[PDB]
Structures are given as C-alpha cells and as structure tokens.
Write a protein that binds this ligand. Structure first.
Ligand SMILES: Clc1ncnc2ccsc12
Ligand SMILES: [Cl-]
Ligand SMILES: [Cl-]
Ligand SMILES: [Cl-]
Ligand SMILES: [Cl-]
Ligand SMILES: [Cl-]
Ligand SMILES: [Mg+2]
Length: 348
C-alpha cells in the first residue's frame, strides 16, 4: 500500500498516493471532479478524477461499476486508457471513495476545427484514427453513442484519442434545442425509431468528417424536428423498406406526413472536396443503419491508402457485459467495484 496525503481542493478533501504531486483543478466538469497532477512514477502529466457519491443509489453504484469495467478494458493507441485506480480505504468496510487516473488531455477537436486551416491530408489522418479506435471498440460489442468533437482529444502531432465511457445516460433536457449534444446523433436514436446498434457511431463519424471538410456543423438543428428536416433534405426521405423497420407506429405516421424528397448530389454540397472523401461520406450518411459502411470496411476505403496497414489495426479482447442485465443491491455493486479496484494491474 502506498503512503497517502490529504489536501482540500476547493471545499473537497482529496487523499492520494505521494506519487501524485502539484494537484490543481482542470476542465469544465464534463467528465466529473478532475484535477491535473504530475505522476512522479511515470513522468506523465495526468488527470485525477474523484467520483461524487459513487454508491448513493442502486443506479449510481451500477454506473460506478460500469465506468471502472469499461476503462479497465480499453487498451488501444486511439482510445482513453486507465493509468491507475485507487482508494484510501484499507478494507471493504471503510470503502467510500474511488479515484481514476488518465493521461491529461490538453485540446479537443473543436479547438483545431474552429481555429486551424486543415489540408485533405489532416482530414485523412484524423478520421483514419477515429475509425481505427472504433474498429477496436466495436470488436468488443461496445457502442460509444456520444461521438462528437468535444469527446476527441488531439495533440500537437495530430494524434487522436476517443473519450466518454460509462458516464450517466444523457437526459432529454441536455438534448433539447440548439445544442451540440444532439447534432451528431443518428436519426434512429434521436427519435427512438427502433432498437439501435453499433451503426449509430458511423453516422456520427460522417457528421464529424463533413465539419472538418467545410468548417461548419452538418446538421445544426434548432430542435429534434428541425434537425430531422435538415437530415432528410440531404439523404432523402425513407422508402418502404426502411419504414417497415420503424417499430414505433406514431414515428412511422409522422414520417409519412412529409413530402417525398430525393437524396442530394454530395459533390454539389461538399464543393471542391477530394472525390474519395465525397464517396466515403455517401457510404457513412445512409438513413437505413443496416446499409451503412462498418469501421473495418471504411479502413480499407481508398481515401485512407496512405495510412491503412491491415497488420496494425488491432481488435479487442472479449468483453463480458452480462452484469448489465443483472439485478443487485447497493452493497453487492459496491463489493464488485472494490474487487476491481484491488485487482488493477498498471500498464507496462
Ligand atoms: Cl473519457 C472518460 N470516460 C469516463 N471516465 C473518465 C475519467 C477520466 S476521462 C474519462
Ligand atoms: Cl506513492
Ligand atoms: Cl491513454
Ligand atoms: Cl474511501
Ligand atoms: Cl462537440
Ligand atoms: Cl471481460
Ligand atoms: Mg456523453
């Protein structure tokens, strides 16, 4: 067991191993209560997250367990990983607090899209890295569900990592009105059309790729219905085949109230873009999720010929998510979480 020391960080008591020094608050609270520190064992600048009220309800205890399981699994160059997890508790009986340690992220994609001039070469390398990380995530039967520029960390060398695993499901209020939290969402999940699957993430990558090419949000809707109208004007209204797959009768009735529209010519929308970029966007932004390109298929597209290496695009170890359908008490979720804290092995 390391030695711990205590300090008050803006009306919060932090108790952490001596290896972590020079703690100071960071971020806009998007990933929880997070400080920056220097890790003296590894020489890296790190983010230390202290969870708020991790065991206060069954819902919160299960969310804590879910976040720790997901972060312990993810071992890939293009995905956030866990550097450490600790508790000052010396037994299950005194366990209350959980702390997670990751690499400190400086800038996200929004900063570079907003403030930098990007070459077709920059767009190739950024989207190649997102798809490489997604091929890995999807091989474990994990759906990200929230890919957007603020969840993509980017460094000076244009190297990228994917963020946001096992945090609270987004509320209907967070999704209301003129908000970036909805602009990257696939239509079948935005409007609850049907049981969704991993194909939702490829819609999101299409929306991100279009914005890197134009410097503008692709579907900046003022509300759910305005955003659906922007989507159908580009990709066309649904045919009988997709309408059959909308399980919700009222959602089917609403769609049929709209005048039919054809798919637009993407070369006249993305004026001057690399024809290979236009071709890939047409294969991602397909209304029927069964027909969209997969991450593994997209890596082999000619747009990525300069970066694609099929011997260096790895898949994940198997991920057991059977706990997700399990009904347990608060103390049972707390015991499962304690075992995952004490069994952690740090990366090489
Ligand atoms: Cl990205 C992400 N998802 C869930 N928890 C954390 C803690 C630090 S970064 C992070
Ligand atoms: Cl230490
Ligand atoms: Cl990492
Ligand atoms: Cl504790
Ligand atoms: Cl964003
Ligand atoms: Cl597993
Ligand atoms: Mg999110």
């Amino acid at each position: 067991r390391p030695t711990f020391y205590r300090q008050e960080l803006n009306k919060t008591i932090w108790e952490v191993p001596e290896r972590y020094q020079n703690l100071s608050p960071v971020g806009s609270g998007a990933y929880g209560s997070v400080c920056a520190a220097f890790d003296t064992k590894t020489g890296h600048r790190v983010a230390v997250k202290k969870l708020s009220r991790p065991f206060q309800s069954i819902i919160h205890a299960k969310r804590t367990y879910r976040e720790l399981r997901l972060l312990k699994h993810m071992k890939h160059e293009n995905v956030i990983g866990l550097l450490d997890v600790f508790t000052p508790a010396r037994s299950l009986e005194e366990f209350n607090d959980v702390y997670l340690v990751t690499h400190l992220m400086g800038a996200d994609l929004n900063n570079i899209v907003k403030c930098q001039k990007l070459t077709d070469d920059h767009v190739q390398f950024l989207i190649y890295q997102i798809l490489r990380g997604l091929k890995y995530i999807h091989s474990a039967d994990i759906i990200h569900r929230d890919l957007k520029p603020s969840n993509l960390a980017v460094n000076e060398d244009c190297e990228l990592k994917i963020l946001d695993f096992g945090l609270a499901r987004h509320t209907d209020d967070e999704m209301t009105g003129y908000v970036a939290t909805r602009w990257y969402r696939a239509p079948e999940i935005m409007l609850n059309w049907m049981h969704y699957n991993q194909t939702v993430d490829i819609w999101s990558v299409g929306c991100i790729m279009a914005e890197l090419l134009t410097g503008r949000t692709l579907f900046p809707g003022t509300d759910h219905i305005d955003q659906l109208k922007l989507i159908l004007r580009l990709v066309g209204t649904p045919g009988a085949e997709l309408l059959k797959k909308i399980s919700s009768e009222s959602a089917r009735n609403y769609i049929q109230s709209l005048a039919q529209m054809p798919k637009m010519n993407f070369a006249n929308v993305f004026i001057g873009a690399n024809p290979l970029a236009v071709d890939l966007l047409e294969k991602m932004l397909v209304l029927d999720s069964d027909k969209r390109i997969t991450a593994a298929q997209a890596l082999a597209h000619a747009y990525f010929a300069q970066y694609h290496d099929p011997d260096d695009e790895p898949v994940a170890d198997p991920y057991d998510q059977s706990f997700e359908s399990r009904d347990l008490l608060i103390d049972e979720w707390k015991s499962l979480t304690y075992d995952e804290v004490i069994s952690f092995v740090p990366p090489p």
